[PDB]
Amino acid sequence: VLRDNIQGITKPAIRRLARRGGVKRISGLIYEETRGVLKVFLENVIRDAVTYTEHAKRKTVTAMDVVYALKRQGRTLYGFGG
Amino acid sequence: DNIQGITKPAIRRLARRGGVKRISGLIYEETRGVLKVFLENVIRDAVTYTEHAKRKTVTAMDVVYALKRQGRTLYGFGG
Amino acid sequence: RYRPGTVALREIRKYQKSTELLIRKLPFQRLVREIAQDFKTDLRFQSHAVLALQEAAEAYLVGLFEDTNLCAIHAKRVTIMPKDIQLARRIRGER
Amino acid sequence: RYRPGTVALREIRKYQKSTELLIRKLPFQRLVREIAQDFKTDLRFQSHAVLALQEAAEAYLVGLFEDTNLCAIHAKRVTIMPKDIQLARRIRGER
Amino acid sequence: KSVSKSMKAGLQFPVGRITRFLKKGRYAQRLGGGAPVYMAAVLEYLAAEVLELAGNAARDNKKSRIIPRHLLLAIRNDEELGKLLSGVTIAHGGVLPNINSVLLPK
Amino acid sequence: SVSKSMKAGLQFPVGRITRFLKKGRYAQRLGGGAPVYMAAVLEYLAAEVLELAGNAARDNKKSRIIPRHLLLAIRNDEELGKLLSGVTIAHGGVLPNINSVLLPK
Amino acid sequence: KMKKKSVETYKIYIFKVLKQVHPDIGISSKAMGIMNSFINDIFEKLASESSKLARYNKKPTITSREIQTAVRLVLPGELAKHAVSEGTKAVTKFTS
Amino acid sequence: SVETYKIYIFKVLKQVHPDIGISSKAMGIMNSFINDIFEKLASESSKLARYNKKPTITSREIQTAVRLVLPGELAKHAVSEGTKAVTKFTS
Amino acid sequence: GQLKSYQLKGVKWLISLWQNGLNGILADQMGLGKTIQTIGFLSHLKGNGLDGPYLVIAPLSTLSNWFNEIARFTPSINAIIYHGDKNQRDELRRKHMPKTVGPKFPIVITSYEVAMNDAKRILRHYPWKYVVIDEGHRLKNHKCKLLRELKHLKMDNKLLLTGTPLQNNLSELWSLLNFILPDIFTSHDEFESWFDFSEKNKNEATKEEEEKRRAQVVSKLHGILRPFILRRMKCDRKKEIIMYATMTDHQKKFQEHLVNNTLEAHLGENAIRGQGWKGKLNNLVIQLRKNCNHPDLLQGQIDGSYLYPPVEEIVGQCGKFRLLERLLVRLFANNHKVLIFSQWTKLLDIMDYYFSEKGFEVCRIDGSVKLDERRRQIKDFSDEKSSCSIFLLSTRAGGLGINLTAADTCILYDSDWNPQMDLQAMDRCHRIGQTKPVHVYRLSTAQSIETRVLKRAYSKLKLEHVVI
DNA sequence: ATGTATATATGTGACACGTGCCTGGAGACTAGGGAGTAATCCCCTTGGCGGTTAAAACGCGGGGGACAGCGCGTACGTGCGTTTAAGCGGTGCTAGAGCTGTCTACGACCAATTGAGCGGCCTCGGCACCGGGATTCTCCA
DNA sequence: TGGAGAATCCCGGTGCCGAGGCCGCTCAATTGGTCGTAGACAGCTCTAGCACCGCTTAAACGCACGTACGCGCTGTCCCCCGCGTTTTAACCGCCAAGGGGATTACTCCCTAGTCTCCAGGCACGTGTCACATATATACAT
């Protein structure tokens, strides 16, 4: 009565992301590695985001926490306020 | 020339430390160029740090801080 | 009808000039909630946080795919293999 | 006498267990003085600065050679080419 | 009447707000006389160069308004700014168009 | 009088951590138990590093710690390898590793 | 009745410098945020570098030479040499 | 005069291993490591205090700094020992 | 003709209201009686020589029904239905409107979804004389503001037909009146004047002698609203039993085990470590309602592949389910037909599993199927040889208005917060033409959370005396 | 089978104890101001429904890369004999790195004004679609 | 080179909404006095890099030589691509109520100063040890 949430990243989305990066042909065994790497990256960001949220005695995650968490990893993101 | 001072057996020993079996005869120029570029990039910051403090001698702390700026922390010498 | 290899280049030329979102938002905010459920219980998320996370994830994935493509071109090939991704992550020091 | 390929492995096993300096000190401090001459005139150098520079340069070169070796093993080869070094520097973002 | 510290220096950025931000951040015990002027001059020069690049990029594509695409095009087509902003990703920016020569049909 | 480190059971000094925090002007005011916490964390890290280094030096039938044993202890642990990935130790050397392709058959 | 807390932004100054540079070019509302973030990031890097340099050399004051060396360190290449010349010209006019 | 942690490192080493000595070249590395960890922790705590508009450094800020800087299982084991020291100091 | 005397009176009332030039709201209870009267009113306003166009806005499920009505009333009267897929929409945009002035203009029937998506086109090229609605239940929370855009162009007359305008929520008369007569805006901005202490009272009959100003406010409340609203009765059976059930000790143990919400530590050892918990409960009332209805609904914590406990012991968890089983086994001797009304499909799945074990075959409308409804009703139901006896319905979904009404007994498992949903549930439950007594039943639990909901719902329903 | 890499006996420059002095951590009075507490209010949340329209899934043929085996050539690893410069010890020499001592001038702090910057509304020109209409792009021939 | 079906910008209208421009406060930005301590300048002392010469002895260079791996070729197979049907979920609205963080008011107790003072941290002298040179066994061609 449910679907897995990691299967929600479908094959055409990964194909479009590869075509944005300039790839001609794509094999049929790279979707699992892409999902695993996306999962690991999201875990590593969300750990710091939840730590920042929990420091300030809050229960809601704001955009500034995500911006500071991305800044800790060296990937500065512009447009949202930091 | 002072860039020819990095001889072939030294480069061969540095490659054997990194675990290389066979070595071609066209990679010494790229190695010398990369070493030159790295030394230039470190020495620029080192000389900037030395010149900030109104001195004329380069100490080890300037080199340690210059390496720290590039993200390569070096231990043993005091920082 | 068309010979293989033309639609791929047309998609490459079309997707590299548009500024949009390629991953759908709703399954991503469920993957984000289900990943955050493991660490703290009963969290809440603003929309800008998940949008920023989506932007960062797409940028990271496009960079990884460009590095993987360069690694695959280095070995005289056109297809993409998992070992290219593993090599790129090993060289970049992510692993 | 010996078959080729044994002395290379013996050198690999011998050089990976010793803590020494592989580059000579005196030509290196002349390369360092001649590189520093271009930026500021009449500089002076302590010995610990050039020793630290030598240590950093050897560590950087060994790391680059290990990455180049991994890139060369990826393409089903035993020899080392400049294009492997260029690929490793392009992936690492040094270039 | 009174004059501002930015009108006499010829700058366009404010000077008392740079002093206010430096004092509110406690970077040191004491400040200097002309340090905020220097910082404002550097920031104004950088902003002027970035706006020159972005305006040239937007004017090249037959447009009269700057969007983040033109900002990304201006940043990614310069060596100095590319070295300055290598690790920065811009929201709604896109990707610089580049196609390898091997993939091109012959 | 008794020291602030004897009552807490620590081995690192406490008034010098306060002196270094005050001399660096990190903020306007400090807390009561922050130097104790910092000293405890530093003491724990030092204890773990010295445990690893002593085990590595005792494994090689030696009774004295050299930087080689320090490098061996750092590079053989995942946690310290993640902590000290970008750090190079003087007179340390290189971890021995040989690829399987280069091995003769 | 206060709508929201006041926010300090460089919108009007960026608009003035843009009108000085190009006479007939406008700007969208999405680029001003990016420009503000860029200016604040450069400001925070310069201030942090100057503070750390002041801390290292055991000096309790921030002077123009510390920010000179901070500009020489942070800004790479030809941008460092061109930013020093404009900044020194402003300081001379302020004193005299 | 130079401030170094030589005697304290020697005391903790004698507490850990009863019959192991240390050379003069490793003490410099250990001092550099301790000073680097101290500077990272202090910088992280100061930046965190600056971000949240708070003028004081408390034990919770350094708690979160330890949770951020130290990765993996080391973060969870450093918090337990540090909290035990603070309890004995107050009471 | 087909229409009776009362319909003629309604027509005359519409003509007399148009004689004063005022836009109209009509709240007739009989659904079919409104549309024929409105069609006759339009036909009276069409044959007189007026050349104004007309817009009808109805839900999509009855538009072809309107196409029946113009077929049933007069074949010379034609109309268009502006409902189609995107390719033929631009084909039919100009098909029957060639010019703003002409001898013949069509009368156009649209939908809510047409008037909300791509609705700018209608105003841009053409005005319309009469605008008529057919439901009137979609203009309360002031979310659809395109009616303001329609108001910007001059709509001369608006007619709004509502089934029941009284849901007893705040400012429904405000919202409805401001769409029909926005002229008085400041008058209603303060509701204190209409509001009285009689609204807030704890009496069962809701009449207090000690309170003051009740009679004057009630008299003025029906008096001012009387010219705006016409409500017509057909004249000028039904038996509802609400049965309560006793709470078992195991479900009560869950109740006072989750008041302090210590479920994580108790079932942590039972669950496999390393799997984790799906999440701490967020809201109190909805979870309390699920717990009161059935604890098995709360089993989202555990994981199994449709793995449900044995049917023999499932009875023990609830007294409501046991009482329903006793009522159903008492009702098999009556040889009658039952309907089961519920609000959540997970309960409609637990029930389905239970009667898939009991061995009786059932018929169900859940809303997962599209256009299979009619086939479901025709096959294994509404037949003399149909062996199905149990019919599962959700109150929020849509069932066909079957005249036959082969099912006479209706069972509500859980109650609704708004009694109008129960009113339409009874409307489907029993319809004209059957003399059969309708013994509606309700399964409730005493001294629980839903008793407050039922009391508030009946207090919500009890304001039908004050409007006419 | 025959020529090279790992285990045991006797001699030597840095460490674990001891003396000495000397600025700082700790015990104690007194301010003060920042970290702790209840009232409004507007966005999430939970289980459902209706309805539309692009998007994803499945299948099927097909042609064009991936891959393995094979052969040739020719650059790189190994060994021996000849220069050569680095490592070392010892000496002479002078710029410059710290280290005190004294003056003076420019930032910190506090009263006292006052005119720019941040909110709110008017008023429209560049940008987003429809709809032809030339203009080329690849796939046969 | 020549057709032929098919993408693809160019030139027009047609609106229309965020950018550019008006008020009304209000609160930090800028003057004037006054104090006080850090930076600038001047000397003074010791030390540690910069030349410089003779010895000598490992190591770099040069040159044969011979062989193993890298690169180009051919044949086969099998696996992604492109196009056409066919379901299906995202997107958008809409109940029905609560609740929970984003914001605003008021008290007390933990931290900053000043003022003293004495065991615990850094400089100078002793006993006592983990690597250098000589004799004995286990593997590759």
What CATH code is carried by the domain that includes residue I267? 3.40.50.300
- d(Cα A31, Cα A33) in Å, to the nearest integer? 6
| Backbone break loci in chain C, preceding residues, C–N > 2.5 A | none
Chain J: nucleotides below 7 Å from protein CB are 5, 14-16, 24-27, 34-35, 44-57, 62-67, 75-79, 85-87, 95-98, 106-108, 115, 117-120, 126-127, 131, 138-140
Resolution in A, one decimal?
A: 3.2
**I231 located within any domain:** no
Q: Is the Cα dihedral F75, F78, F82, F84 positive or negative?
A: negative
Q: From residue B43, how far is each of D38, G54, G77 by CA, in Å?
A: 10, 21, 14
Q: Which domains does chain H have, with CATH numbers?
A: 23-90 (1.10.20.10)
Angle at H45 between CA H43 and CA H51, to 5 degrees: 100
Count Cα atoms within 13 angstroms, Cβ side, for E81. Answer: 18
The DSSP-derived string for chain C is -PPTTHHHHHHHHHHTS-----S-HHHHHHHHHHHHTTTSSS-EE-HHHHHHHHHHHHHHHHHHHHHHHHHHHHTT-SS--HHHHHHHHHHHT--
H-type helices in I77-117, by residue range?
86-92
Task: Measure F8 CA to nearest chain D CA, in Å.
Answer: 40
Q: Which long-range contacts (CB under 8 A, 24 or more apart) does B41-50 make?
A: B41/B70, B42/B66, B42/B67, B42/B70, B42/D53, B42/D56, B43/D32, B43/D35, B43/D36, B43/D39, B44/D39, B45/B69, B45/B70, B45/G73, B46/D49, B47/D36, B47/D39, B47/D40, B47/D43, B48/G69, B48/G72, B48/G73, B50/D40, B50/D43
Tell the residue number behind the tokens 């898939």, with chain if given: I356
Q: Which two tokens stand for residue F101?
A: 């392709």
Which of G34, G40, G41 has the CB atom closest to A79's CB atom? G34
Provide the H-helix boundaries in chain F.
4-8, 15-23, 34-59, 67-75, 78-83
Experimental method reported for this structure: cryo-EM
Beta strands in I118-193 (DSSP E): 130-133, 157-161
The C-alpha atoms of residue F57 and residue F74 are separated, in whole angstroms, by 12
Q: Which residue is nearest to nucleotide K83 (CA to C1')?
A: C1
Dihedral of CA E71/E72/E73/E75: which sign?
Answer: positive
Contact yes or no for E47 and G39 at CB 8 A? yes
Number of domains into which chain I is organized: 2
> How many Å lie between the alpha carbon of C80 and the closest alpha carbon of chain D?
14
End-of-domain residue from the set I225, I258, I273? I225
Distance F71 CA to J133 C1' (A): 74
User: Count of E–F CB contacts within 8 Å?
Assistant: 3
Residue C34 lies in a domain: yes
The half-sphere exposure of C23 on its side-chain side, counting CA atoms within 13 A, is 29
Enumerate the residues of chain C whose CB falls inside 8 A of the CB of residue E97.
Answer: 13, 16-17
Q: How far apart are CA F100 and CA F105, in angstroms?
A: 10
β-strands A76-78, I409-412 pairing: unpaired
Bridge partners of residue E23, in order along the sequence? none
- List own/partner pairs for H41-45 with CB under 8 A and 24 or more apart: H41/F38, H41/F41, H41/H65, H41/H66, H41/H69, H42/F21, H42/F24, H42/F26, H44/H68, H44/H69, H45/F26
Smallest Cβ distance to H89: which of F7, F13, F43? F7
The count of other CB atoms within 10 Å of the CB of residue B27 is 20
Which two structure tokens, joined as six digits, stand for H22?
Answer: 């240390």
The residue segments making up the domain with residue C20 are 6-92
Q: Which candidate in E23, E24, E26, E30 is best for mutational testing of the F interface (most F CBs within 10 A)?
A: E26
Neighbours of chain C (3+ CB pairs under 8 A): A, D, E, I
User: Domains in chain F and their CATH numbers?
Assistant: 4-83 (1.10.20.10)
Q: Chain I contacts of C37, Cβ < 8 Å?
A: 276, 278-279
| Cβ–Cβ below 8 Å for A20 and E103 | no
Tell me if C1 is assigned to some domain.
Answer: no
Nearest CA of chain G to the CA of B45: how many Å? 7
* H/E element, D26: helix D25-36
Distance CA H25, CA E80 (A): 42
In angstroms, the separation between the Cα of residue C2 and the nearest Cα of chain A is: 16
Chains touching chain H, criterion 3+ CB pairs below 8 Å: A, B, F
User: Of how many residues is chain H composed?
Assistant: 91
Which domains are assigned to chain A?
A: 1-82 (1.10.20.10)
Run of H or E including E70: helix E68-76
Residues in the annotated binding site of I for ATP: 28-35
Cβ atoms F53, F77 nearer than 8 A: no
Query: Cβ separation of D45 and B47 shorter than 8 Å?
Result: no
Q: Which nucleotide is nearest to D75 (CA to C1')?
A: K70
Q: How far apart are alpha carbons H82 and H62 in whole angstroms?
A: 10
Straight-line distance from CA C45 to C1' J45, in Å? 12
Q: Examine the domain organization and report whether I101 and I62 are in the same domain.
A: yes
Q: Report the distance from CA of residue B7 to the C1' of nucleotide K57 in Å, as an integer.
A: 20
SS3 E90: strand
Residues of D in contact with C75 (CB under 8 A): 74-75
Read off the amino acid at residue E29: Q
Supply the CATH number for residue D81's domain.
1.10.20.10
- Residue at B73: amino acid letter: T
- I248 and I218 together in one domain: no
* Single-letter amino acid, residue I306: Y
- Nearest nucleotide, C1' to the C-alpha of C79? J65
Q: What's the CA E17/C1' K20 distance, rounded, in angstroms?
A: 26
Contact H68 A48 (CB under 8 A): yes
Is there a contact between G73 and B48 if contact means CB atoms under 8 Å apart?
A: yes
Q: Can you read off the two tokens belonging to residue H55?
A: 């003028």
Answer whether C19 sits within 8 Å of E99, measured CB to CB.
Answer: no
Q: Give the nearest chain A residue to H64 (CA atoms).
A: A55
Residue D19 CA from chain centroid, whole number: 15
Nearest-angstrom CA–CA distance, I209 and I190: 26
Question: Nearest by CB to H57, which of F26, F43, F82?
Answer: F26
Q: How many domains does chain C have?
A: 1
Closest Cα in chain B, distance from residue D15 (Å): 6
Report the CATH number at residue I184: 3.40.50.10810
I362 in Cβ contact with I390 (< 8 Å): yes
H touches B, CB cut-off 8 Å, minimum 3 pairs? yes
Q: Which chains touch D (3 or more CB pairs under 8 A)?
A: B, C, F
Chains I and H are touching, with contact defined as 3 or more CB–CB pairs separated by less than 8 Å: no
From I94, I98, I95, I64, select the one nearest I81 (Cα to Cα): I64
Structure tokens at I416: 């609704």
Beta carbons of D46 and B5 less than 8 Å apart: no
Contact: A18, C53; criterion CB under 8 Å: no
As a whole number of angstroms, the distance between CA F58 and CA F52 comes to 10
In this complex, is the C-beta atom of I237 within 8 Å of any C-beta atom belonging to chain C?
A: no
Half-sphere exposure of E11 (CA within 13 A, CB side): 30
Q: Is residue I232 part of a domain?
A: no
Q: Among E93, E97, E100, whose Cβ lies nearest the Cβ of C73? A: E100
Residue B78: closest CA among chain H residues belongs to which residue?
A: H32
Which nucleotides of chain K are near protein (any atom < 7 Å from a CB)? 7-8, 16, 18-20, 28-31, 38-40, 48-50, 59-61, 67-71, 79-84, 90-91, 93-104, 110-112, 120-123, 130-131, 140-141
Closest-CA distance, B54 to chain F, in angstroms, reads 24
- DSSP reduced 3-state for B22: coil
Alpha carbons I246 and I446: distance in angstroms, whole number:
7
Contact of D52 with B64, CB cutoff 8 Å: yes
Last residue of a domain, one of I180, I200, I225: I225
- Residue I266 sits at φ, ψ, to 5 deg, of -75, -45
Q: Is residue D30 part of a domain?
A: yes
Q: Is the dihedral of CA F42, F43, F47, F50 positive or negative?
A: positive
d(CA F85, CA F78): 10
- Facing residue for F102 by CB, picked from B21, B71, B73: B21
HSE-up of residue I117 (Cα within 13 Å, Cβ side): 10
- Residue D45 has phi, psi (to 5 degrees) of -130, 130
Which stretches within I137-282 are classed as H helix? Answer: 146-152, 172-180, 214-225, 249-258, 263-268
Residue D78's contacts (CB-CB under 8 Å, 6 or more residues apart) are B21, B22, D72, F101, F102
Do I401 and I281 belong to one domain?
A: yes
Mutate to test the interface with H, among F7, F23, F65 (most CBs of H within 10 A): F65
Q: Measure in Å the smallest separation between the Cα of C73 and chain E Cα atoms.
A: 8
Angstrom distance, E65 CA to K14 C1': 22
How far, in Å, CA of E22 to CA of G44, rounded?
10
Cβ distance of B48 and G72 shorter than 8 Å: yes
Residues contacting I231, CB < 8 A, separation 6+:
I27, I28, I29, I468
Between the alpha carbon of residue A10 and those of residues A13, A31, C12, C30, the distances in Å are 6, 9, 19, 14
CA distance E86 to E76: 9
Q: What is the domain extent for residue I432?
A: 238-464
Q: Which residues contact C11 (CB under 8 A, 6 or more apart)?
A: A16, A19
- Please tell me the number of Cα atoms within 13 Å of E94 on its side-chain side: 22
- How many Å does it take to go from CA E68 to C1' J58? 41
Q: Is residue D1 part of a domain?
A: no
How far apart, in whole angstroms, are the C-alpha atoms of residue I274 and residue I286? Answer: 29
Could you tell me the CA-to-CA distances from I25 to I181, I229, I467 in Å, in that order?
10, 6, 14
Q: What are all long-range contacts of F79-83, with beta carbons under 8 Å and residues at least 24 apart? A: F79/H71, F79/H72, F79/H73, F79/H74, F80/F49, F80/F52, F82/H71, F82/H72, F83/H70, F83/H71, F83/H74
Q: CA(H7)–C1'(K121) in Å? A: 10
Separation CA I197–CA I217 (nearest Å): 10
Binding-site positions of I read: 28-35
Nearest CA in chain D to B66: D53
| Cβ–Cβ gap B39/D35 under 8 Å | yes
> Burial of A23 by CB count in 10 Å (0-12 exposed, 13-18 middle, 19+ buried)?
buried
Backbone angle region of B4, left / alpha / beta, with phi > 0 → left and psi within -120 to 50 → alpha: alpha
Looking at residue D58, its amino acid is: E
Phi, psi of I102 (to 5 degrees): -175, 170
